[PDB]
Design a protein around this nucleic acid. Structure first.
Ligand code: CU
Length: 293
DNA sequence: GCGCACCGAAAGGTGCGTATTGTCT
């Protein structure tokens, strides 16, 4: 699954949650939850773990190396864009196999699927440039990306996902950093989701897993049935309950109704004990009759 | 954007809209 969200100033705070380890076990320097990506990042001398400080600066539009603040051309009657959030979420069974049964290779599989997809999003990175009143679009091919891997849903179910925060910046041929023209990436969301799916599936098959493709075109490991997946999909059940209570048909709901059911069905965000949580996951798995073999 | 209206100052730049699967900020 791939979802995108354009980030404006009012979401800059949410750029903090990316660090508040939505992840846990592997967040502890185990392959480290965060990582920079992109030719643009390399252009700014950035690799490895993402720095909370530097990231906050780039979100604000500050390169720092002797440059002026970016996006000053933003109309004051409009929202300053600080980035584009591309969230990759693995199939449930996959999350189970990696987080419950514990299989770091799945985590690597997911990270590769994500990294290869971002390389494709990068090839769609564009900027604008005007000359004598004539505007032109320029495929810059470079992006600065902060990737944050997390492991749980709002209901504390296993939920392997990464937030690929594409910063609103790109370097043109002339060497100037400009806001990102996100048309291409935004309109390529569905396609990029398939690239993720394909890359993930490939990586999973190389580890030896058998995949079961459903109608959608999505998949889940073969040794885990639907009922078992639903037992670790509480948010899904909450959303379905909302539609039921509203007498709505999930097979045809306006965006307003869909977003209303996602947001309004959310419960109170309480902390947990990562150690105890996993033991719960395992106990639950057994009850559901899951064989992580 | 389906080109405009603003921003700042560079015969320059930016938002805007875009998006619509499920495992579900
Ligand atoms: Cu998350």
């Amino acid at each position: 699954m791939l979802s995108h969200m354009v980030l404006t100033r009012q979401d800059i705070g949410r750029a903090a949650s990316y660090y508040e380890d939505g992840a846990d076990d592997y967040y502890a320097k185990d392959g480290d939850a965060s990582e920079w990506q992109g030719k643009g990042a390399e252009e700014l001398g950035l690799s490895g773990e993402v720095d909370s400080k530097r990231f906050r600066e780039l979100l604000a539009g500050n390169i720092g190396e002797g440059h002026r603040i970016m996006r000053s051309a933003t109309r004051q009657d409009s929202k300053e864009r600080i980035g584009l959030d591309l969230t990759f979420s693995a199939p449930k069974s996959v999350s189970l196999q990696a987080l419950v049964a514990g299989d770091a290779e799945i985590i690597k599989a997911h990270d590769r699927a994500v990294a290869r997809t971002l390389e494709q999003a990068e090839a769609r990175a564009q900027a604008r440039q005007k000359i004598q009143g004539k505007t032109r679009i320029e495929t810059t091919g470079n992006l600065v990306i902060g990737k944050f891997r997390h492991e749980t849903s709002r209901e504390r179910d296993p939920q392997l996902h990464t937030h690929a925060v594409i910063l609103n910046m790109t370097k043109r041929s002339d060497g100037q950093w400009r806001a990102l023209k996100n048309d291409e990436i935004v309109k390529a969301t569905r396609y990029l989701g398939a690239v993720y799916n394909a890359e993930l599936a490939h990586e999973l098959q190389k580890l030896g897993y058998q995949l079961r493709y459903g109608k959608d075109g999505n998949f889940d490991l073969a040794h885990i049935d639907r009922q078992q997946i639903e037992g670790f999909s509480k948010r899904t059940e909450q959303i379905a309950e909302w539609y039921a209570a509203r007498g709505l048909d999930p097979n045809s709901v306006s965006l307003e109704q869909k977003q209303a059911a996602k947001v309004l069905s959310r419960a109170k965000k309480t902390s947990v004990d990562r150690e105890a949580l996993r033991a719960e996951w395992q106990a639950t798995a057994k009850e559901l009759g899951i064989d992580f073999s």
